[PDB]
Amino acid sequence: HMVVADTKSLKLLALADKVAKTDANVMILGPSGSGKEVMSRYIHNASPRKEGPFIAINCAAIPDNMLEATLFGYEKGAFTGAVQACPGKFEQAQGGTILLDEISEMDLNLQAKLLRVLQEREVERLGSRKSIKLDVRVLATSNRDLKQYVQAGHFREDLYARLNVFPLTWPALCERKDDIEPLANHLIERHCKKLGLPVPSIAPNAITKLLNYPWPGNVRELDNVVQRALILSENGHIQSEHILLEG
Numbered sequence: 001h002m003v004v005a006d007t008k009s010l011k012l013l014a015l016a017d018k019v020a021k022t023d024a025n026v027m028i029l030g031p032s033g034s035g036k037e038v039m040s041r042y043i044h045n046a047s048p049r050k051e052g053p054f055i056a057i058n059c060a061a062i063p064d065n066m067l068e069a070t071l072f073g074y075e076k077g078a079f080t081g082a083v084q085a086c087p088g089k090f091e092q093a094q095g096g097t098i099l100l101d102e103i104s105e106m107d108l109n110l111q112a113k114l115l116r117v118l119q120e121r122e123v124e125r126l127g128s129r130k131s132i133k134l135d136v137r138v139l140a141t142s143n144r145d146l147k148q149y150v151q152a153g154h155f156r157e158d159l160y161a162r163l164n165v166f167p168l169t170w171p172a173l174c175e176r177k178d179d180i181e182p183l184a185n186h187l188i189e190r191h192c193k194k195l196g197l198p199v200p201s202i203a204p205n206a207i208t209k210l211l212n213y214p215w216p217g218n219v220r221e222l223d224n225v226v227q228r229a230l231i232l233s234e235n236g237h238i239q240s241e242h243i244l245l246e247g
């Protein structure tokens, strides 16, 4: 469930609904921590493939260089370490939506493999010559200007141009300050609901303290400050004294 309130955020959801209805590749830009994922799910849930699978994979957090292996899947013996066969994330997302989180972290070669998938609408596991028909809607995210990243020669221009049909730039928290208060209360609410506690209120002085912080870590920091405040207030009424930022 996504909560927006700023007129700037409302304009983005207005666009999001328009692409959700289609099968177009959506590219969600913006800084780290602005929740450019909870929007992809929104796009999924607003898409005709809502009832379908929703497969997410973070290309910047897959250890032991298993990004390629987990995306396409592999047969037994495709590489040293492949003791078993394994379906790829594209196969798991059949009839639904796949999210390529932080897509700017794919090596140039993996981007070439991804391109063929997008073009031919088919995938083949590592060590398999047999192609698998794919009916999958593609979403992707990046916290870096892909255009200049293409210009830097670290990203394929053709891949960028296939993913930049309908870009959406989810802005920093300080450029959408009207999102801050509803967002804070939502985070308070999800933690009290996670521990069966009644949700407490937040003081006026606390809100102002929250509004006048630039939030360099954006919503992922807001979540921290709130968790911190809930610890300090012992799940009670949050005052301007339980809110510790970085100043």
Ligand SMILES: Nc1ncnc2c1ncn2[C@@H]1O[C@H](COP(=O)(O)OP(=O)(O)O)[C@@H](O)[C@H]1O
Binding pocket: 001, 002, 003, 004, 031, 032, 033, 034, 035, 036, 037, 038, 141, 183, 186, 219, 220, 223
């Ligand atoms: N508009 C929003 N509504 C509700 N939750 C949000 C919103 N924006 C960010 N969040 C929260 O911020 C957290 C981080 O979002 P995430 O999509 O992981 O950011 P990023 O992908 O940019 O690192 C999530 O827990 C998410 O619930």
